[PDB]
């Protein structure tokens, strides 16, 4: 294989990557230089009948539940197609905001449909990357040559549509994917060394090399959690590694007020200028001098304050033990991805479910230990393969739907639609989508 990039993007029916359902996936493969080498891959996911989309999401995407249902395949087949693209060897799977959103959608789709939620991103020399934190890093650290738009609040905006507009990039189903490729080419051209640096440091071992806990060696870190008001940037120092999470290091934000850290106990601590950096999540980290004096000035970052805090922290190493202590501590199976890793035996069993013909599942005679699996398998069969359900199973599914579609939920859904149709009365496209959402809800739930 040669190294490739797979740019992708989901449209979904709501904001929650587990509890809302996907609507559409789009992707295209490029070579290592961002030349398109594949065909556009665009397809839909039929939503199961235990779900109503968030009206807000449909207003954004323009994709109705009727359209995804008519054009889509079941989530099992949707998952299969995405897994086949993602597991091509030597693929860097990337998008725009995928680390915090799309990748969580992928993990949950794989989880619900009996794929490994994690292996795709690293096996066969694969990786992931995310152009959102690349753009944020450019603004903070190397803003030359790119136009940086402000939003209506007066803050720098990193919405993809704003950055393409501001930089002369033309921006159907493939719009977002092609815009993301355009942004990658933009940074590679205008900030070549930073682009190379950020690409190389997507690798967790390269990130590890930057981390010197004994010395509390300061680093620049660009993170959306720091806020657009300071260009999402600060100087941080590593205090300790997370006592449970092998991939998380506990950083102190040196720009913060460290008083609570010094003069408060770990229980009270559990603002507090502590954050986890997850080395498997493409965090932006670099040597402290990567943030140049002019840019620190521009972003309002106070170097002396950071250095004074760093000095205090180094002179008080008992703070390390303190922060380690901080981190030393629903019944919906769809929400339970992070309730733990499955055992080896359970993954083996789940693989048999995956590789068994849907018509043969009712007679499958395997054993699971993890308590999530019985429910995962029932939902998987009832959502994807409802013609294979026996009478008792149909009754179970009917009860499931009744438990989702509570009186409070249905009333609130009707209320939201009626509110939105008044609010958007002058937008004829939106009014039409809302009427479609009402009609779908009438069919599914009333
Ligand atoms: Mg997106």
Distance from Cα 160 to the centre of ligand 1, integer Å: 9
Distance from Cα 101 to the centre of ligand 1, integer Å: 8
List, as one string, the DSSP characters of 120-167. Answer: GGTGGG-EEEEHHHHHHHHHHH--TTS---B-TTSSB---HHHHHHHT
Distance from Cα 415 to the centre of ligand 1, integer Å: 28
Distance from Cα 6 to the centre of ligand 1, integer Å: 14
Alpha carbon distance 89, 2 (integer Å): 8
Question: Residue 251: which of 204, 211, 308, 284 has the closest Cα?
Answer: 211
List, as one string, the DSSP characters of 327-392. Answer: HT----GGG-GGG-PPPHHHHHHHHHHHHS-GGGGGG------STHHHHHHHHHHHHH-GGG--HH
Positive or negative, the CA dihedral 128, 131, 133, 137 is positive
Domain 204-329: state its class.
Answer: alpha beta
Distance from Cα 28 to the centre of ligand 1, integer Å: 14
Give ranges for CATH 1.10.287.1240 in the chain.
391-446
Distance from Cα 106 to the centre of ligand 1, integer Å: 12
3 state DSSP class of 168: coil
Distance from Cα 182 to the centre of ligand 1, integer Å: 15
Show the CA angle centred on residue 321, arms to residues 319 and 325, nearest 5°: 115
Distance from Cα 19 to the centre of ligand 1, integer Å: 17
Alpha carbon distance 276, 216 (integer Å): 15
Helical H segments across 151-258, by residue range: 160-166, 175-190, 192-200, 204-208
H helices, E strands: number in the chain? 19, 11
Q: Residue 98: exposed, middle, or buried by beta-carbon count in 10 A (0-12, 13-18, 19+)?
A: buried
Cβ atoms of residues 227 and 244 within 8 Å? no
Alpha carbon distance 335, 342 (integer Å): 15
| 9 among annotated binding-site residues | yes
| 415 among annotated binding-site residues | no
Domain 391-446: state its class.
Answer: mainly alpha
Enter the tokens of residue 87: 């597991």
Task: Give bridge partners of residue 242 from the DSSP assignment.
Answer: none
Q: Could you name the CATH architecture of 330-390?
A: Up-down Bundle (1.20)
Distance from Cα 94 to the centre of ligand 1, integer Å: 11
Alpha-carbon torsion, ordered 140, 207, 309, 257, to 10 deg? 70
Distance from Cα 125 to the centre of ligand 1, integer Å: 25
Q: Residue 367: exposed, middle, or buried by beta-carbon count in 10 A (0-12, 13-18, 19+)?
A: exposed
Distance from Cα 294 to the centre of ligand 1, integer Å: 33
Which experimental technique did the depositors report for determining this structure? Answer: X-ray
Task: Give bridge partners of residue 25 from the DSSP assignment.
Answer: 10, 43
| 159 among annotated binding-site residues | yes
Distance from Cα 95 to the centre of ligand 1, integer Å: 7
Distance from Cα 342 to the centre of ligand 1, integer Å: 29
Give ranges for CATH 3.30.420.10 in the chain.
1-191
Distance from Cα 91 to the centre of ligand 1, integer Å: 19
Cβ atoms of residues 11 and 27 within 8 Å? no
Distance from Cα 387 to the centre of ligand 1, integer Å: 34
Distance from Cα 64 to the centre of ligand 1, integer Å: 17
Cβ atoms of residues 204 and 278 within 8 Å? no
Give ranges for CATH 1.20.1280.70 in the chain.
330-390
Instruction: Give the experimental resolution in Å.
Output: 1.7
Give ranges for CATH 3.30.1520.20 in the chain.
204-329
Q: Could you name the CATH architecture of 1-191?
A: 2-Layer Sandwich (3.30)
- Please name the residue that has the structure tokens 């620049």: 220
Give backbone dihedrals phi and psi of 284, rounded to 5 degrees, phi first: -85, 115
């Amino acid at each position: 294989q040669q190294s490739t990039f797979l740019f992708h993007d989901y449209e979904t029916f709501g904001t929650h990557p587990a509890l809302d359902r996907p609507a559409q996936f789009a992707a295209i493969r490029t070579d290592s230089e961002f030349n398109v080498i594949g065909e556009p891959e665009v397809f839909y996911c039929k939503p199961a009948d235990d779900y109503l989309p968030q009206p807000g999401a449909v207003l954004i995407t323009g994709i109705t539940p009727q359209e995804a249902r008519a054009k889509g395949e079941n989530e099992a087949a949707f998952a299969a197609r995405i897994h086949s693209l993602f597991t091509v060897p030597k693929t860097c799977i990337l998008g725009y905001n995928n680390v915090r959103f799309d990748d969580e959608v992928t993990r949950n789709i794989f989880y619900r449909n009996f794929y490994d939620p994690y292996a795709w991103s690293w096996q066969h020399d694969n990786s992931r990357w995310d152009l959102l934190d690349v753009m944020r890093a450019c603004y903070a650290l190397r803003p030359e040559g790119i136009n940086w738009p402000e939003n209506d609040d007066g803050l720098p905006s990193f919405r993809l549509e704003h950055l393409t507009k501001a930089n002369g990039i033309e921006h159907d189903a493939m719009a977002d994917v092609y815009a993301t490729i355009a942004m990658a080419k933009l940074v590679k051209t205008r900030q070549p060394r930073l682009f190379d640096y950020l690409f190389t440091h997507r690798n967790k071992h390269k990130l590890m090399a930057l981390i010197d806990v004994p010395q509390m060696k300061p680093l620049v870190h660009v993170s959306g959690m720091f806020g657009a008001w300071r260009g999402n940037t600060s100087w941080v120092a590593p205090l300790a590694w997370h006592p449970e999470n092998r991939n998380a290091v506990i950083m102190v934000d040196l720009a913060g007020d460290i008083s609570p850290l010094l003069e408060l106990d770990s229980d009270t601590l559990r603002a507090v200028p502590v954050k986890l950096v997850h080395i498997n999540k493409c965090p932006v980290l670099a040597q402290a001098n990567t943030l140049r004096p002019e840019d620190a000035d521009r972003l309002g970052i106070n170097r002396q304050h950071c250095l004074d805090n760093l000095k205090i922290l180094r002179e008080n190493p008992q703070v390390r033990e303190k922060v380690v202590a901080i981190f030393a501590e629903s019944d919906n199976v769809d929400a339970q991805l992070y309730n733990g890793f499955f055992s080896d035996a359970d993954r083996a069993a789940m693989k048999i479910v995956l590789e068994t013909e849907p018509r043969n599942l009712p007679a499958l005679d395997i054993t699971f230990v993890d308590k999530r699996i019985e429910k995962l398998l029932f939902n998987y069969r009832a959502r994807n393969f409802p013609g294979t359900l026996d009478y008792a199973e149909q009754q179970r599914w009917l009860e499931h739907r009744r438990q989702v579609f509570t009186p409070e939920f249905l009333q609130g859904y009707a209320d939201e639609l009626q509110m939105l149709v008044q609010q958007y009365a002058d937008d004829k496209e939106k009014v039409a989508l809302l009427k479609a959402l009402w009609q779908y809800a009438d069919e599914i739930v009333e």
